[PDB]
Design a protein around this ligand. Structure first.
Ligand SMILES: [O]C1=C2[C]C3=C([O])C(=[C]C(S([O])(=O)=O)=[C]3)[C]C3=[C]C(S([O])(=O)=O)=[C]C(=C3[O])[C][C@@]3([Br-])=C([O])C(=[C]C(S([O])(=O)=O)=[C]3)[C]C1=[C]C(Br)=[C]2
Ligand SMILES: O=S(=O)(O)c1cc2c(O)c(c1)Cc1cc(S(=O)(=O)O)cc(c1O)Cc1cc(S(=O)(=O)O)cc(c1O)Cc1cc(Br)cc(c1O)C2
Ligand SMILES: O=S(=O)(O)c1cc2c(O)c(c1)Cc1cc(S(=O)(=O)O)cc(c1O)Cc1cc(S(=O)(=O)O)cc(c1O)Cc1cc(Br)cc(c1O)C2
Ligand code: HEC
Length: 108
C-alpha cells in the first residue's frame, strides 16, 4: 500500500463509527474490546501496556507505519490470520487514507 494524506475530518467520522467501539486513542486511555492505540505508529504489534493479545498478533510483530496499517485495515484477518479483531476491513483506498490521516493525528 501507498498511504496518501486525506481528510482527518472524514477519518474521524470513520474512526468514531467503525473503531471507537473497541479502541481509544488518547494517552493513558483504557482498553475497551481492543487495545488503546496511543503511540501505535512507530510501535510493534502486540505491545500496548496492559493488553492481552492473541499469539498471532504478537507473533506478527509488525512495526506499524501508514503503509502496512493501510494493508492491515483493508482486511485484518488476511494480514494477521488468527487475530481476534472482529473487523472485516475497509476496501476503499479513500476510506483507509482518511482514517489513517486521522489516526496519525489522534494517536501521536
Ligand atoms: O465530489 C465528489 C463526489 C460528490 C460528493 C462530494 O463532493 C462530497 C461528499 C460526498 S459524500 O456523499 O461522500 O458525502 C459526495 C464533498 C466532499 C467531501 C470530502 S470528504 O473529505 O469529507 O470525504 C472530500 C471531497 C468532497 O468534495 C473532495 C473530493 Br471526494 C472530491 O470532491 C472528489 C474526490 C475525492 S478523492 O478523495 O476520491 O480524490 C475528494 C470528487 C467526488 C467524487 C465522487 Br465519486 C462523488
Ligand atoms: O465496507 S467496504 O469495505 O467499504 C465494502 C466496499 C465494497 C463492497 O462491495 C463491500 C464492502 C461488500 C463486499 C464484501 C466482501 S467481504 O470481504 O467478503 O465481506 C466481499 C465482496 C463485497 O462486495 C465481494 C468483493 C470482494 C473484493 S476483494 O478485493 O476480494 O475484497 C472486491 C470487490 C468485491 O465486490 C470489488 C470492490 C472493490 C472496492 Br475498492 C470496493 C467495493 C467493491 O465491491 C465496494
Ligand atoms: O473519480 S474519482 O474521483 O476518482 C472517484 C472517487 C470515489 C469513487 O467512489 C469513485 C470515483 C467511483 C464512483 C463513481 C461514480 S460516478 O462516476 O458518478 O458514476 C459514482 C459512485 C462512485 O463510487 C457512487 C458514489 C456517488 C456519489 S455521489 O455524491 O452521488 O455523486 C458519492 C459517492 C459514491 O461512491 C461516495 C464518494 C464520495 C467521495 Br467525495 C469520493 C468517493 C466516493 O465513493 C470515492
Ligand atoms: C472490536 C469489535 C474491534 C473493532 C470494531 C476494531 N478493532 Fe482493532 N482490534 C480489536 C482487538 C480485539 C485487537 C487485538 C487483536 C489481537 O489479535 O490481539 C485489535 C487490534 C488492532 C490493532 C493492532 C494493535 C496492536 O498491535 O497494538 C490496530 C492497529 C487496530 N486494531 C486498529 C483498528 C482500527 C483503526 C479499527 C477501525 C477501523 C479497528 N481496529 C476496529 C478489536 C476491534
Amino acid at each position: 500500500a501507498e498511504f496518501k494524506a486525506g481528510s482527518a475530518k472524514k477519518g474521524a467520522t470513520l474512526f468514531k463509527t467503525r473503531c471507537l467501539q473497541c479502541h481509544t486513542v488518547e494517552k493513558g486511555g483504557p482498553h475497551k474490546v481492543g487495545p488503546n492505540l496511543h503511540g501505535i505508529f512507530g510501535r510493534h504489534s502486540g505491545q500496548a501496556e496492559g493488553y492481552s493479545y492473541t499469539d498471532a498478533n504478537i507473533k506478527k510483530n509488525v512495526l506499524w507505519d501508514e503503509n502496512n496499517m493501510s494493508e492491515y485495515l483493508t482486511n485484518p484477518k488476511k494480514y494477521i490470520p488468527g487475530t481476534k479483531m472482529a473487523f472485516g476491513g475497509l476496501k476503499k483506498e479513500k476510506d483507509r487514507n482518511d482514517l489513517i490521516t486521522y489516526l496519525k493525528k489522534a494517536t501521536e
